[PDB]
Design a protein around this ligand. Structure first.
Ligand code: BTN
Ligand code: BTN
Ligand code: BTN
Ligand code: BTN
Lengths: 123, 123, 123, 123
């Protein structure tokens, strides 16, 4: 993929969380996520996808991934999805918006979903 | 997983799109998506995660998945993430909210991301 | 406004909440909201804006409004914004997506904002 | 209102847009918005609401507002809502997430709504 090398590695967001990803040639993303906040401890599995043949006109590279917040330590009964774009160069970034959905009863489902935004850097 | 059997299979949303997923015991989701709308044709790879040990108190099952909108036919230079919950029973549903991010230039990045909501049924 | 008459009146969403609005010629929206759910009781002030000269090509009419969830009875320390479009005709609707922000400490601000979607009808 | 004085005035976001607001004692927000981006020129009317009696525990102040993107110069057939919180102190900020809805045909309504985030400062 054009940015396979650029995306693969360890990223950090403004909260202090750590995103560890491998980009495959075909568009896969696999890795681990460790949140600095919330009902979370240690690493969680992630998977996702990215555009392995982006535009050559200076546009970013679209991608996304999911974490279900269950591991051997905790289960928050929740999942987050991040949707965003990789922007390459000396100050590389992944700019995302995310959706965190809790399992709820039907009566509470109106209040099931948090929205926010994370920016990941290599430093 | 508690809902491995409930989630695995073919789902359809209010647009007429078709979501084909396999749920693994461990929390994986793998499959294909075919959109009835947008800059899309035929099937695209998806991956995601779900809570394989949900609450037993009538709450839904949190899950999410991604599609990068590249296949052998088209490349929209975009990715969607769906975040939601599976609700089991005679009228099973997956209720989601989604985020569709386009690769953009930095000048247009304010306008990179669409938000919406899809409800999937087995019929 | 083109839809001043169509928008003005009493609307109900899928939760059972009641939206009472007056549309002004100039684009204003003023009224009251009464939620069927959440940390809310009785009516709350709303204000917002709508496109008073929409496209004539069958497109909906863009609009939005806010409620801060303080009245004489309760204060949730929160505000919701609905962003959407009015679609006229025998089955008129307002289709919206909303953002509910809580006041939080800086440590909890990542979790400050809920997202959802409401559809309002005249019946 | 507790933050009537703190909110009232001229704010600027990371795009260079200019938000000019007056906060009323009762919870009103009135003013003008001028966007540095998009299908916009000059000032547009805004209205909204804020929590005029916030928590005293260091939490921010919830608020929101709307702009319909029609004025004497242009009509984008769209509306944005910002939902967020005011945080007072030497570095005051308004942190928001927003929803920009376009009027669309029913066939294109899935793609009607952009989501993003703006941070406003006094400098
Ligand atoms: O509390 C939970 O339900 C599980 C932890 C969620 C942490 C969220 S995911 C979005 C944001 N970005 C992070 O790095 N952490 C929070
Ligand atoms: O146009 C694109 O960029 C690729 C197709 C996007 C189709 C979207 S994904 C969200 C919504 N749900 C669907 O089933 N289709 C649309
Ligand atoms: O709980 C709160 O903070 C105040 C009540 C919020 C009720 C929300 S606003 C979005 C959704 N639509 C409704 O009609 N009610 C809920
Ligand atoms: O293009 C349009 O439909 C009207 C202009 C929209 C400008 C948006 S509103 C959200 C973001 N914040 C800004 O200051 N400008 C853009």
């Amino acid at each position: 993929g054009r940015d396979e090398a650029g995306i693969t590695g360890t990223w950090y967001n403004q909260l202090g969380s750590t995103f560890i990803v491998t980009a495959g040639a075909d568009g896969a993303l696999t890795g681990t996520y460790e949140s600095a906040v919330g009902n979370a401890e240690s690493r969680y599995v992630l998977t996702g996808r990215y555009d392995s043949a982006p535009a050559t006109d200076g546009s970013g590279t679209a991608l996304g991934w999911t974490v279900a917040w269950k591991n051997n330590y905790r289960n928050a009964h929740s999942a987050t999805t991040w949707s965003g774009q990789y922007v390459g160069g000396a100050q590389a970034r992944i700019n995302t918006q995310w959706l965190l959905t809790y399992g709820t009863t039907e009566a509470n489902a109106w209040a099931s979903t948090l929205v926010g935004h994370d920016t990941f850097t290599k430093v």
